Amino acid sequence: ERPDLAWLDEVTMTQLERNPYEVYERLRAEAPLAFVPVLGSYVASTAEVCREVATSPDFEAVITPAGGRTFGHPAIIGVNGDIHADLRSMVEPALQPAEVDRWIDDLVRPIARRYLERFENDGHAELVAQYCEPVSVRSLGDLLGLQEVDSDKLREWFAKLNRSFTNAAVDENGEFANPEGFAEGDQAKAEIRAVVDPLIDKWIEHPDDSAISHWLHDGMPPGQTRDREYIYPTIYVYLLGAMQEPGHGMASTLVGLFSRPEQLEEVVDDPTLIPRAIAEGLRWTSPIWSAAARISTKPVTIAGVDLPAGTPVMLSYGSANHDTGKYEAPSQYDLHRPPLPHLAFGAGNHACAGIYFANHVMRIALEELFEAIPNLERDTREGVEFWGWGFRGPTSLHVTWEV
Ligand code: HEM
Ligand SMILES: COc1ccccc1O
């Protein structure tokens, strides 16, 4: 429909998943808000357009079509009004900074040590599967009340929900081009129900200090609980992004540091620099790269485009965090970049609710790793591939150390 962008017709889902950067570099220059045919949606590629859409009074929350097919209703990321207010009040207590500070160290640090103890003397490791992912899911899983769900299973669930949620390709008629791509999402949800339904049964009659027990009971009249069908979509929100992204953030940070060996040494020498390294890592490869969206509630003009009411816009925060109007050489990792606002946690009233928790999980994990293996080296016999358009991170991170 937009003639000068006819090249967008030839962009593929696989290309966006393998490497979205060239297409989005072109988008940021030619059309900060652009309809991408294979995604079937407008996409916002620049920091200005992403932040405007995420905070605009003329936009409200929505899930991308494949995300809605995966999570259903009411997922906290895609609802508004009183429902959203209730779901926010539901998840917020255990994420409050003063509360996190009470227990985050006794939570994450023994978990990090346990996973490190399995390989820290091996001299070689694949840190995504052996460390970054297990620490992320074990920390959150224990907080939720899923202590007895093995980290292998939690990692499998977030991988299947990832692929279902991002099964976004549409054909010439706007229909999903890969309809069998949702089946492993459906299978993951079926497995989650068989595991979590008996836990919910128990928590209803015998509440405890797990987060999910508090989702059932907090703020309810005496003897009442939130119906499980009302909270499961937000459980799924957690079992995808909240489980996956701290691991993505850690690993992308390590990859960025390895690309600046002078800066990796600095951080290992002075671990007070770990929060700064993580912040740049999230800017450099944003874990929730283009999974979020908003929908317009009235006619609105964005980046010169007159959008009718009811128009979805995908928020490609990962591209926004490479906006060359904001950063110098944003494709390069630079620990010493001046700290600026970034959009890796989103913006607006649907901005990330778990920032403080997530940053601590990533910080403690990297502190323990560098203490256990100060001579960590990237295994340059293998290259690092990143995968994902909706959610993005390294598929593996092979490392060595002397020893
Ligand atoms: C580095 C790790 C993480 C990153 C980069 C991240 C990023 C994001 C992003 C981009 C969104 C959508 C924001 C928007 O649409 O504008 C989001 C939403 C959310 N995240 Fe985080 N997230 C991370 C970890 C976590 C963790 C560990 C939790 C929970 C313990 C969590 C809880 C939530 C919740 C509840 C929402 C929904 C907020 C709402 O819709 O009102 N996140 N996150
Ligand atoms: C925090 O988890 C998510 C955020 C945005 C989209 C999907 C998620 O699971």
Curated annotation (Swiss-Prot):
Heme binds at residues 84, 88, 294, 317, 347, 350, 352. GO terms for molecular function: heme binding; iron ion binding; monooxygenase activity; oxidoreductase activity, acting on paired donors, with incorporation or reduction of molecular oxygen. Belongs to the cytochrome P450 family. Its cofactor is heme b. SUPFAM superfamilies: Cytochrome P450. This is Aromatic O-demethylase, cytochrome P450 subunit. Its EC number is 1.14.14.-. It comes from the Bacteria. Part of a two-component P450 system that efficiently O-demethylates diverse aromatic substrates such as guaiacol and a wide variety of lignin-derived monomers. Is likely involved in lignin degradation, allowing Amycolatopsis sp. ATCC 39116 to catabolize plant biomass. GcoA binds and processes the substrate with electrons supplied by the GcoB subunit. InterPro entries: Cyt_P450 (IPR001128), Cyt_P450_B (IPR002397), Cyt_P450_CS (IPR017972), Cyt_P450_sf (IPR036396). Monomer. Forms a heterodimer with GcoB. The lineage of its organism: Bacteria, Bacillati, Actinomycetota, Actinomycetes, Pseudonocardiales. Keywords: Aromatic hydrocarbons catabolism, Heme, Iron, Metal-binding, Monooxygenase, Oxidoreductase. The gene is gcoA. Pathway: Aromatic compound metabolism. Substrate binds at residues 237, 241. GO terms for biological process: catabolic process. It catalyses: guaiacol + reduced [NADH--hemoprotein reductase] + O2 = oxidized [NADH--hemoprotein reductase] + catechol + formaldehyde + H2O + H(+); 3-methoxycatechol + reduced [NADH--hemoprotein reductase] + O2 = 1,2,3-trihydroxybenzene + oxidized [NADH--hemoprotein reductase] + formaldehyde + H2O + H(+); anisole + reduced [NADH--hemoprotein reductase] + O2 = oxidized [NADH--hemoprotein reductase] + phenol + formaldehyde + H2O + H(+); guaethol + reduced [NADH--hemoprotein reductase] + O2 = oxidized [NADH--hemoprotein reductase] + catechol + acetaldehyde + H2O + H(+).
